[PDB]
Design an enzyme around this catalytic site. Structure first.
Site, PDB file in Angstrom:
ATOM      1  N   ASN A 286       0.833  -1.201   0.000  1.00 49.51           N
ATOM      2  CA  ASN A 286       0.000   0.000   0.000  1.00 49.51           C
ATOM      3  C   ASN A 286       0.865   1.248   0.000  1.00 49.51           C
ATOM      4  O   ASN A 286       1.910   1.310   0.645  1.00 49.51           O
ATOM      5  CB  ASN A 286      -0.997   0.008   1.176  1.00 49.51           C
ATOM      6  CG  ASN A 286      -0.417   0.584   2.441  1.00 49.51           C
ATOM      7  OD1 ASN A 286      -0.451   1.800   2.640  1.00 49.51           O
ATOM      8  ND2 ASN A 286       0.123  -0.279   3.306  1.00 49.51           N
TER       9      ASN A 286
ATOM     10  N   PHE B  39      -2.090   8.171   4.560  1.00 55.78           N
ATOM     11  CA  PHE B  39      -2.975   8.666   5.643  1.00 55.78           C
ATOM     12  C   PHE B  39      -4.229   9.357   5.130  1.00 55.78           C
ATOM     13  O   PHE B  39      -4.553  10.478   5.541  1.00 55.78           O
ATOM     14  CB  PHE B  39      -2.309   9.660   6.601  1.00 55.78           C
ATOM     15  CG  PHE B  39      -1.215   9.090   7.490  1.00 55.78           C
ATOM     16  CD1 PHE B  39      -1.140   7.745   7.806  1.00 55.78           C
ATOM     17  CD2 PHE B  39      -0.274   9.953   8.032  1.00 55.78           C
ATOM     18  CE1 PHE B  39      -0.122   7.281   8.620  1.00 55.78           C
ATOM     19  CE2 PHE B  39       0.723   9.513   8.832  1.00 55.78           C
ATOM     20  CZ  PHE B  39       0.822   8.168   9.129  1.00 55.78           C
TER      21      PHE B  39
ATOM     22  N   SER C  38       4.821   4.936   9.238  1.00 56.63           N
ATOM     23  CA  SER C  38       4.295   4.788   7.881  1.00 56.63           C
ATOM     24  C   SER C  38       5.406   5.030   6.865  1.00 56.63           C
ATOM     25  O   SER C  38       6.117   6.043   6.967  1.00 56.63           O
ATOM     26  CB  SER C  38       3.181   5.796   7.620  1.00 56.63           C
ATOM     27  OG  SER C  38       2.863   5.762   6.248  1.00 56.63           O
TER      28      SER C  38
ATOM     29  N   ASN D 112       4.740   5.895   3.831  1.00 56.91           N
ATOM     30  CA  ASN D 112       4.069   6.593   2.732  1.00 56.91           C
ATOM     31  C   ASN D 112       3.853   8.077   2.996  1.00 56.91           C
ATOM     32  O   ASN D 112       3.204   8.759   2.196  1.00 56.91           O
ATOM     33  CB  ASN D 112       2.743   5.905   2.439  1.00 56.91           C
ATOM     34  CG  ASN D 112       2.943   4.458   2.102  1.00 56.91           C
ATOM     35  OD1 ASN D 112       3.897   4.106   1.401  1.00 56.91           O
ATOM     36  ND2 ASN D 112       2.104   3.609   2.637  1.00 56.91           N
ATOM     37  N   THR D 113       4.391   8.597   4.082  1.00 49.94           N
ATOM     38  CA  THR D 113       4.407  10.036   4.320  1.00 49.94           C
ATOM     39  C   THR D 113       5.864  10.458   4.350  1.00 49.94           C
ATOM     40  O   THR D 113       6.615  10.010   5.237  1.00 49.94           O
ATOM     41  CB  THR D 113       3.713  10.398   5.628  1.00 49.94           C
ATOM     42  OG1 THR D 113       2.308  10.152   5.494  1.00 49.94           O
ATOM     43  CG2 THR D 113       3.939  11.886   5.963  1.00 49.94           C
TER      44      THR D 113
ATOM     45  N   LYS E 180       4.247   3.036  17.430  1.00 49.67           N
ATOM     46  CA  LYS E 180       4.311   2.034  16.370  1.00 49.67           C
ATOM     47  C   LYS E 180       5.604   2.227  15.591  1.00 49.67           C
ATOM     48  O   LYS E 180       5.843   3.308  15.048  1.00 49.67           O
ATOM     49  CB  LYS E 180       3.101   2.122  15.453  1.00 49.67           C
ATOM     50  CG  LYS E 180       3.049   0.950  14.486  1.00 49.67           C
ATOM     51  CD  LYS E 180       1.695   0.858  13.839  1.00 49.67           C
ATOM     52  CE  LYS E 180       1.546  -0.402  12.982  1.00 49.67           C
ATOM     53  NZ  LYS E 180       0.230  -0.487  12.361  1.00 49.67           N
TER      54      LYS E 180
ATOM     55  N   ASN F 130       5.035  -1.924  11.853  1.00 49.28           N
ATOM     56  CA  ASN F 130       4.410  -1.464  10.629  1.00 49.28           C
ATOM     57  C   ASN F 130       4.934  -2.263   9.436  1.00 49.28           C
ATOM     58  O   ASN F 130       5.650  -3.265   9.577  1.00 49.28           O
ATOM     59  CB  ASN F 130       4.664   0.035  10.491  1.00 49.28           C
ATOM     60  CG  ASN F 130       3.499   0.771   9.879  1.00 49.28           C
ATOM     61  OD1 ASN F 130       2.915   0.318   8.898  1.00 49.28           O
ATOM     62  ND2 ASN F 130       3.154   1.926  10.449  1.00 49.28           N
ATOM     63  N   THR F 131       4.560  -1.819   8.234  1.00 45.50           N
ATOM     64  CA  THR F 131       4.886  -2.503   6.999  1.00 45.50           C
ATOM     65  C   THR F 131       6.362  -2.323   6.690  1.00 45.50           C
ATOM     66  O   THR F 131       7.031  -1.415   7.219  1.00 45.50           O
ATOM     67  CB  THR F 131       4.056  -1.929   5.850  1.00 45.50           C
ATOM     68  OG1 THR F 131       4.255  -0.510   5.829  1.00 45.50           O
ATOM     69  CG2 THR F 131       2.580  -2.263   6.035  1.00 45.50           C
TER      70      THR F 131
END
Ligand SMILES: Cc1c(C2(c3ccc(C(F)(F)F)nc3)CC2)c[nH]c1C(=O)N[C@H](C)c1cc(C#N)[nH]n1
Ligand SMILES: Cc1cc2nc3c(=O)[nH]c(=O)nc-3n(C[C@H](O)[C@H](O)[C@H](O)COP(=O)(O)O)c2cc1C
Ligand SMILES: O=C(O)c1cc(=O)[nH]c(=O)[nH]1
Length: 372
Positions: A116, A120, A187, A189-190, A235, A264-265
């Site tokens: 993914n 967010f 994350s 992705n940020t 996290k 997390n991922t």
């Protein structure tokens, strides 16, 4: 018997969705069913010997739903009543965001994995707080929800310069409704978010969040399950070197964090054919061993003083026991709910209970960290 999560039609529909229907459409359909309270449910008593706790948070069973599943807290009751003890909503940000461009989510059924790059997407802290308030009001009127736990994951808007400002904003608006707050510094992705795992920045982040929470009192307050101030979790991302992990552990000990969500991922999995050349973090079965090893590392770096919330590749009772024996007190699912569907919680609880019988444990708490 459509009420029953294991009703044979659900697997048939899910197998078809996983083959033919876009992942985000599948997720929207799920949320729509939950919106109208037409998901199946299991409100059976759970085994008292599989309960667990982090500090005063008493989980009726050891399985919750991880962050990023009900990002907006619009599906809390219905997801819980599948048989989970808790849900972590969010990650939320002060302002709403629609997230990165689509397609951004891809599933690989063969490897039970997801990638993914969501970014967010959420309705924003103010709107999600309204949604959570509505749930808390229903919870006050429904004894079958009175022991369920809701954590809130909090993060920063993409364009925010100082993360702490956004974390404080969320604390001041939603903190009084949360059983715990999960600080998302992991994350992938940020842009720049994972840099906040550096020890100096993370220490300041944790102390600022705890101060803001502690000040809510100064300025019935706790409209949550515990009727107590939310606990604070962090996290963590699995893509760290050993120096970074140890430095994080030192910070967590010094700042008295209540729990760490591991993990997390990952951005380091390269052997899923359908994911080649795709941006984002990988979830699911291919994350299990990386994240279990990370649990063992952090359990030892923190000298067993910081409870662990396991996330990563948990699908079976056996997977769950691996996480618990590695040091986790409680488990979060995400990929399992995607690939196994409505029956996820009923099935995995059953498997874990049988495994605790087979392995000789008196209860689940006896198993925590037994690998060490
Ligand atoms: C397959 C699935 C489902 C289930 C489902 C959906 C629809 C139906 C129906 F009743 F319609 F048949 N049954 C079961 C198994 C539970 C929920 N979610 C997903 C999913 O694939 N989610 C992706 C990864 C996702 C995640 C995000 C974000 N954030 N966006 N997209
Ligand atoms: C589509 C998607 C969105 C996610 N969004 C969030 C999020 O907003 N916050 C967060 O902390 N984790 C988020 N996650 C990570 C999951 O909570 C979880 O840690 C990860 O998927 C590993 O667990 P799993 O292997 O069981 O799926 C997301 C994962 C996926 C697949
Ligand atoms: O919003 C996302 O893209 C996201 C957040 C997060 O924390 N983890 C993840 O895998 N995706």
């Amino acid at each position: 018997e459509s009420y029953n999560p294991e009703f044979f039609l659900y697997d048939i529909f899910l197998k078809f969705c996983l083959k033919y229907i876009d992942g985000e459409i599948c997720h929207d359909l799920f949320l729509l069913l939950g919106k109208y309270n037409i998901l199946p449910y299991d409100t059976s008593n759970d085994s008292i010997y599989a309960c667990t706790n982090i500090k005063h948070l008493d989980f009726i069973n050891p399985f919750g739903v991880a962050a990023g599943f009900d990002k907006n807290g619009v599906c809390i009751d219905s997801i819980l009543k599948l048989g989970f003890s808790f849900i972590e909503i969010g990650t939320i940000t002060p302002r709403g965001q629609t997230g990165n461009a689509k397609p951004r989510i891809f599933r690989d059924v063969e490897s039970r994995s997801i990638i993914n790059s969501c970014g967010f997407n959420n309705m924003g802290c103010d709107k999600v707080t309204e949604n959570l308030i509505l749930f808390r009001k229903r919870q006050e009127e429904d004894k079958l929800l009175s022991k369920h736990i809701v954590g809130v994951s909090i993060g920063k808007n993409k364009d925010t310069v100082n993360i702490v400002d956004d974390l404080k904003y969320c604390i001041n608006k939603i903190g009084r409704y949360a059983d715990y707050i999960a600080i998302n510094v992991s994350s992938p992705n940020t842009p720049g978010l994972r840099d906040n795992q550096e020890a100096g920045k993370l220490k300041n982040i944790i102390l600022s969040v705890k101060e803001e929470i502690d000040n809510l009192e100064k300025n019935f307050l706790w409209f949550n399950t515990t009727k107590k101030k939310p606990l604070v979790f962090v996290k963590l991302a699995p893509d760290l070197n050993q120096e970074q992990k140890k430095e994080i552990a030192d910070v967590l000990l010094e700042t008295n964090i209540d729990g760490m969500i591991i993990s997390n991922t990952t951005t380091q999995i390269n052997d899923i054919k359908s994911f080649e050349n795709k941006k984002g973090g990988v979830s699911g079965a291919k994350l299990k061993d990386i994240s279990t090893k990370f649990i063992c590392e952090m359990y030892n770096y923190t000298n067993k003083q910081i409870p662990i919330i396991a996330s990563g590749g948990i699908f079976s009772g056996l997977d769950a026991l691996e996480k618990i024996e590695a040091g986790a007190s409680v488990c979060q699912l995400y990929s399992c709910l995607v690939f196994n569907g409505m029956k996820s919680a009923v099935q995995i609880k059953r498997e874990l209970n049988h495994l605790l019988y087979q392995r000789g444990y008196y209860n689940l708490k006896e198993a925590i960290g037994r690998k060490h």
